[PDB]
Amino acid sequence: MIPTEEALRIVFGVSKRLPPVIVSLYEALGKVLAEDIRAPDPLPPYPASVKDGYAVVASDGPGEYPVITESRAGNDGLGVTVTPGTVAYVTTGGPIPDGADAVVQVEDTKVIGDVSKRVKILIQTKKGTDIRRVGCDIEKDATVLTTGERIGASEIGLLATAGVTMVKVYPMPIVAILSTGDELVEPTAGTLGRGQIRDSNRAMLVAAVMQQQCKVVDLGIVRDDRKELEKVLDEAVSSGVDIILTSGGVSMGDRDFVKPLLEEKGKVYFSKVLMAPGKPLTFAEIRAKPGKTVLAFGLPGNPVSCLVCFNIFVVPTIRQLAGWTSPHPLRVRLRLQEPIKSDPIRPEFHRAIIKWKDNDGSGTPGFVAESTGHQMSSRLLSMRSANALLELPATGNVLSAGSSVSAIIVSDISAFSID
Amino acid sequence: MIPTEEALRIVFGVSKRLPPVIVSLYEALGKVLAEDIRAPDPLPPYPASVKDGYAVVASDGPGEYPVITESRAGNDGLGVTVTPGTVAYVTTGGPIPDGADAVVQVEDTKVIGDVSKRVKILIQTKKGTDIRRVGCDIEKDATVLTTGERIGASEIGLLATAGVTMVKVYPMPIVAILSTGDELVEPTAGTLGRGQIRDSNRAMLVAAVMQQQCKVVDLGIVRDDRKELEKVLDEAVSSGVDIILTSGGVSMGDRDFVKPLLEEKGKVYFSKVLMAPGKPLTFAEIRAKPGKTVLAFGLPGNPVSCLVCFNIFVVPTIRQLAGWTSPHPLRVRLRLQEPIKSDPIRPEFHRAIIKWKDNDGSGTPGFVAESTGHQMSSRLLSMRSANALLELPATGNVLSAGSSVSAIIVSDISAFSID
Numbered sequence A, B: 001m002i003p004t005e006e007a008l009r010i011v012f013g014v015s016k017r018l019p020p021v022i023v024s025l026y027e028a029l030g031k032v033l034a035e036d037i038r039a040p041d042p043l044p045p046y047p048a049s050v051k052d053g054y055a056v057v058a059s060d061g062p063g064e065y066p067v068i069t070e071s072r073a074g075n076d077g078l079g080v081t082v083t084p085g086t087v088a089y090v091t092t093g094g095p096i097p098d099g100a101d102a103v104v105q106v107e108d109t110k111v112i113g114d115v116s117k118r119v120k121i122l123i124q125t126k127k128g129t130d131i132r133r134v135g136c137d138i139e140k141d142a143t144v145l146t147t148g149e150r151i152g153a154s155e156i157g158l159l160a161t162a163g164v165t166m167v168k169v170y171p172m173p174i175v176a177i178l179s180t181g182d183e184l185v186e187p188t189a190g191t192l193g194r195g196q197i198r199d200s201n202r203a204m205l206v207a208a209v210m211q212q213q214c215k216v217v218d219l220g221i222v223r224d225d226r227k228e229l230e231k232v233l234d235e236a237v238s239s240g241v242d243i244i245l246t247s248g249g250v251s252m253g254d255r256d257f258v259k260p261l262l263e264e265k266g267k268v269y270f271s272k273v274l275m276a277p278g279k280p281l282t283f284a285e286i287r288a289k290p291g292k293t294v295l296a297f298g299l300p301g302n303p304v305s306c307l308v309c310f311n312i313f314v315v316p317t318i319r320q321l322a323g324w325t326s327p328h329p330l331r332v333r334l335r336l337q338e339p340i341k342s343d344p345i346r347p348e349f350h351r352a353i354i355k356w357k358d359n360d361g362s363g364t365p366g367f368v369a370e371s372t373g374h375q376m377s378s379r380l381l382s383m384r385s386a387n388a389l390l391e392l393p394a395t396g397n398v399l400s401a402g403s404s405v406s407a408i409i410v411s412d413i414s415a416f417s418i419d
């Protein structure tokens, strides 16, 4: 039985980034860049007006002038030179005609006469005003994105700016998932027979892996039969998946075949971890027959222990395989809203609902946590709406309301419900 | 020109939750529940062993006993009664045979004899030990999930536990997106002609809306022609979308037709907002001809202003339409890592890269922010890797390094890179 920090170190050490692939622009969203991106031309590639108004010779100053061209896009005003004593109409983003060196916004002008257009410039501007010189936003050949950078909406915008519609990225791993147990029935089952429960772990893990943006291979319910489980594991290993997640069949039962099968097919690095919830957690590395590595997590059957182990150990593995340079979860410090009794032996991943408050109970703003109630590993209601796992050290003491603890954030911080 | 708080209030007031729909279990992930979910049977539905070991009569105490049945699942041990002086083998989750009232884990036992199985119980247990009574995790008819609750991995697990594979939820809105401008070319363009730039806003917004888990209707580049834009807007309004996002054609240019077209087709509530970056932002409500409401955001053309307006105004609208009870973004308080000059008029949404530190500069842990550099609205590099918008009030003063500010978190807090 090893501590969680060592189990994490072992997993990190074995887990290797996947080979990069080439994807389309919209397929690159959420993925980590596997190449630098350089701008092939400047932004703007022509001197561009910041305003709707008139391009002028700054030294002319206030006065009445003829409008000699109109420039909004493309070739508008090509071959026209704005000489002293003339102006040109411009819209925001419109090319500045040759000879003009400043823009006066339309609010500081007035159109004069009926019909040959004439405008009155009402201010004394300065050379360069309200003009974006060539490459002022992005210089030609500048690096706009680098290897190891995750692609979000702004990064897609930068790729589109640079004319990149096919992108070299690190792919997401493909994850196979199965449930084990003679007591399991499908979640479509209505009336349950004696000694049956619905398989909840498989759908829970399919959803958890879909939230990590990975493809899922659903291998269904497997019975507590060594030959049957070996066949499904052999089929999973040869299918091309990168990660296998099983649940159950990893405790001390006489028909728990996941750990001995993983010892036979590959290298098991650990089967037990010092923590609450649970204890059994097998991690193995299997070589597929040519040729590649498959990581296997023999997750515990208890629904809570299953999802907590997915959150602490599988999520950083998915991220490492997908090329994340920072795969660890966000850890914050927070104050307890109620007292919690800590265990004298097992450090606990206590489920909580956390929120940011203007006063965290100490007079200054901060996160605060509410427990989800009873933490028994069989009680999936303790995971309901939990957006954090409080890291409670094994002291045996009651942590009073208002005391500060470390907390792992397990669900979208941008999706946090406000206080 | 109205303040951002009033523009937000107006948007919230007009935006209505979409009618609920029925979806499959995996389609319900990310969606908000539109019904309560009750457990049709208890969990566990039979007295279940917490351990792999032996079910006993607690009052028997330590001694040697015959093993009269084995119980792992289903009908194992049905019709067998564990009487005083007998025991039954059990695995975790296995049904407790009639007459047994406690479980002794296999570690506190030893098998005796060769071959008729016999076991030695090594401890004095207590009635109820290591048994999950019927409904101890979930009682029959208990409410396991409620209306207004967002479905994540644990909630999918609870739906599977309760045998619910078709779920009543609030759907995501469908969003139409178009770009405007005679200066635009597709992002596939190689060498640019004079006065052209690649359309970056459309792909940026398509990606931003895909991150909000909404279906996208890509309506492409529209030119600065009033009849052409009216036709594309009429087609968008009649297509069945809930939200329309345009960008550009909303400043003071003589070919900016988005605002006058939105005034003609529906009700425009505002066209200008007091903020930095930018200023133009049209919001309108259109009635589709029978019959439903379509919300239109005439977003600014400047890439930064376009994405910031999407983040502050469109994201809470998507969430309100999708039935979120808490659609506002997470706001935290943080310390500046560098000095920032605030504007004397326009309150700013200053882009920053924020991280949680053990020491935020004041001796206690907290978030800290680094500016992304120059904040010009034409500079999409200022959005690069920005996970927050610092809310800088319009004071005209320099906010020194170490001063605290309010910050809107705009990207996954669970995806935050650690310090």
Ligand SMILES: Nc1ncnc2c1ncn2[C@@H]1O[C@H](COP(=O)(O)O)[C@@H](O)[C@H]1O
Residues within 6 Å of the ligand: A048, A091, A092, A093, A094, B179, B180, B181, B183, B184, B197, B198, B199, B200, B201, B202, B247, B248, B249, B250, B251, B253, B256, B300, B301, B302, B303
């Ligand atoms: N799709 C787009 N991608 C990049 N820049 C744009 C886009 N649409 C408009 N712009 C720019 O945003 C600014 C304001 O646009 P407008 O409001 O149409 O004058 C101008 O500099 C435009 O060139």
Ligand SMILES: Nc1ncnc2c1ncn2[C@@H]1O[C@H](COP(=O)(O)O)[C@@H](O)[C@H]1O
Residues within 6 Å of the ligand: A179, A180, A181, A183, A184, A197, A198, A199, A200, A201, A202, A247, A248, A249, A250, A251, A253, A256, A300, A301, A302, A303, B048, B091, B092, B093, B094
């Ligand atoms: N797919 C599943 N869904 C819900 N509970 C499960 C699942 N698989 C195993 N369990 C339960 O988790 C506990 C430990 O499983 P095991 O390690 O197979 O003994 C037992 O109470 C099982 O009934």
Ligand SMILES: [Cl-]
Residues within 6 Å of the ligand: A191, A192, A193
């Ligand atoms: Cl039945």
Ligand SMILES: [Cl-]
Residues within 6 Å of the ligand: A276, A277, A278, A376, A377
């Ligand atoms: Cl436990």
Ligand SMILES: [Cl-]
Residues within 6 Å of the ligand: B191, B192, B193
């Ligand atoms: Cl060309």
Ligand SMILES: [Cl-]
Residues within 6 Å of the ligand: B276, B277, B278, B376, B377
């Ligand atoms: Cl601006």
Ligand SMILES: [Mg+2]
Residues within 6 Å of the ligand: A180, A181, A182, A248, A249, A301, B093
């Ligand atoms: Mg089992």
Ligand SMILES: [Mg+2]
Residues within 6 Å of the ligand: A093, B180, B181, B182, B248, B249, B301
């Ligand atoms: Mg335009």
